[PDB]
Amino acid sequence: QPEPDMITIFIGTWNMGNAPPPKKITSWFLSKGQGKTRDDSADYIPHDIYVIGTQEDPLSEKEWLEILKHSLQEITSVTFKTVAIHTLWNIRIVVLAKPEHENRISHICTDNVKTGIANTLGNKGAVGVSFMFNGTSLGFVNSHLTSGSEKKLRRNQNYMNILRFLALGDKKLSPFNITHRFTHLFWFGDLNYRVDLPTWEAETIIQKIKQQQYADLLSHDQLLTERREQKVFLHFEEEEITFAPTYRFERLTRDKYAYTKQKATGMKYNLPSWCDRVLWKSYPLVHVVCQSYGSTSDIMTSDHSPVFATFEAGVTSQFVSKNGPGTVDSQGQIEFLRCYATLKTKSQTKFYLEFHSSCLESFVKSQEGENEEGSEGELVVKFGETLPKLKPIISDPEYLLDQHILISIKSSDSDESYGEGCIALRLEATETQLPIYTPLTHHGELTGHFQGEIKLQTSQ
Numbered sequence: 001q002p003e004p005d006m007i008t009i010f011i012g013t014w015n016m017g018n019a020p021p022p023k024k025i026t027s028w029f030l031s032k033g034q035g036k037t038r039d040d041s042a043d044y045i046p047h048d049i050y051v052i053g054t055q056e057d058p059l060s061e062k063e064w065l066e067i068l069k070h071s072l073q074e075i076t077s078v079t080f081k082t083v084a085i086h087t088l089w090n091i092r093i094v095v096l097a098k099p100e101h102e103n104r105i106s107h108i109c110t111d112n113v114k115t116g117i118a119n120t121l122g123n124k125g126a127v128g129v130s131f132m133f134n135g136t137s138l139g140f141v142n143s144h145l146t147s148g149s150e151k152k153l154r155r156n157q158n159y160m161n162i163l164r165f166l167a168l169g170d171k172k173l174s175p176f177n178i179t180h181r182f183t184h185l186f187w188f189g190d191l192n193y194r195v196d197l198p199t200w201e202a203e204t205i206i207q208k209i210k211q212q213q214y215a216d217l218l219s220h221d222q223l224l225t226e227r228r229e230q231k232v233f234l235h236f237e238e239e240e241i242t243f244a245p246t247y248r249f250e251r252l253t254r255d256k257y258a259y260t261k262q263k264a265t266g267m268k269y270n271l272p273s274w275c276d277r278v279l280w281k282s283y284p285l286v287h288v289v290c291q292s293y294g295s296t297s298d299i300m301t302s303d304h305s306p307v308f309a310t311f312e313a314g315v316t317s318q319f320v321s322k323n324g325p326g327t328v329d330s331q332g333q334i335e336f337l338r339c340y341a342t343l344k345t346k347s348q349t350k351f352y353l354e355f356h357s358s359c360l361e362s363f364v365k366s367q368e369g370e371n372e373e374g375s376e377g378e379l380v381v382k383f384g385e386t387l388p389k390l391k392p393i394i395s396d397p398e399y400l401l402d403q404h405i406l407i408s409i410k411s412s413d414s415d416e417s418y419g420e421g422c423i424a425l426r427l428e429a430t431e432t433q434l435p436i437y438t439p440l441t442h443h444g445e446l447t448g449h450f451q452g453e454i455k456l457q458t459s460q
């Protein structure tokens with residue numbers, strides 16, 4: 001039975017509004033309703049992995065697991081295995097996988113982050129799961145961010161706290177936050193970004209939704225605008241939104257948006273908004289294709305509609321050679337030429353690099369670079385031809401060209417990372433000097449750039 005080189009992943013996000021679900025929720029897992037929907041001819045084909053994020057979930061873990069497993073069994077005739085479940089308050093993540101994947105999945109991690117301080121600590125934050133699927137690391141974050149049209153900055157702050165403090169993936173990757181630890185990272189939830197139009201325009205917005213004319217609403221969506229100004233979710237992707245706003249509905253119909261201010265809303269308007277979202281970030285030149293992104297039309301217990309997204313995701317096998325793992329393969333090497341970091345820091349300390357990759361026996365520290373002044377005020381850290389030669393554990397090009405090198409630039413004075421990035425070894429050529437480039441971030445904010453040339457030797 002061959003190891004897969006592609007899997008499909010279902011991501012669901014639903015804010016349940018502290019109400020039990022209806023008896024049938026299969027439309028969610030079938031990607032049926034509004035938006036980019038799944039072909040009917042696929043309905044019996046199980047996804048490899050289902051990741052369900054809920055918010056305002058009133059159920060016990062046991063109650064929800066029974067609903068989910070029985071739903072998937074009805075659709076697919078497959079009894080899914082529970083990989084992980086983690087709940088913080090009423091925020092929950094469930095990972096289910098086909099039974100054939102049980103011995104492909106390992107290194108399962110769960111964590112949560114509580115956002116806010118005093119007043120604002122007590123119901124918002126995130127849960128997450130990570131694991132290895134054969135040679136591929138997968139991370140999943142379900143967040144319920146701060147509500148309210150006038151709190152987009154708080155949401156962005158909640159995002160940065162979650163990506164700093166959520167402890168998933170390989171703890172040996174100590175310089176790297178969750179935005180660098182995974183081949184594929186899926187981040188979803190009730191992100192709570194709103195359509196930022198005047199209150200007086202509520203009936204106009206509803207009119208536009210009834211006509212399926214979303215363009216003038218999406219141009220005011222706070223997540224799209226904040227992402228375009230690099231205030232949040234830098235270097236993440238989102239599929240085009242082609243479904244109606246998923247909030248705020250009157251319960252038991254989808255015929256009505258409930259937007260007017262009420263005691264129950266803290267006298268806040270809730271103009272129709274795309275609160276409920278799925279974003280991803282995959283390492284460079286790895287296959288990831290969104291095959292659905294939409295909302296259900298027939299699940300009406302909540303003031304939110306469920307959102308679904310599905311993905312094709314490239315995966316690799318757990319490679320063994322005569323040599324690595326447990327030694328190097330002298331036939332493999334990674335060299336760096338003409339490399340320099342450009343950093344935004346106003347500080348003057350020496351810097352060195354760390355190279356981290358599961359193709360190395362352990363991480364590699366460089367010598368200190370040479371600091372120069374850039375012509376527009378920047379710090380340029382020159383490594384020239386001084387970076388070490390990296391010794392991969394396996395030289396086979398079928399393995400090595402599928403790997404990635406994480407790079408941290410660290411202060412010699414403090415050993416604190418000033419920037420993190422990632423370089424794909426999926427090169428156009430081996431034994432050939434080729435340009436490389438990554439942006440550098442720290443706490444998910446842009447801090448600089450790393451560029452230079454690479455020369456990769458494989459056993460071919």
Ligand SMILES: *Sc1ccccc1Cl
Pocket residue numbers: 107108109110167168169170171
């Ligand atoms: S499994 C895991 C991942 C990251 C930090 C700590 C742990 Cl136990």
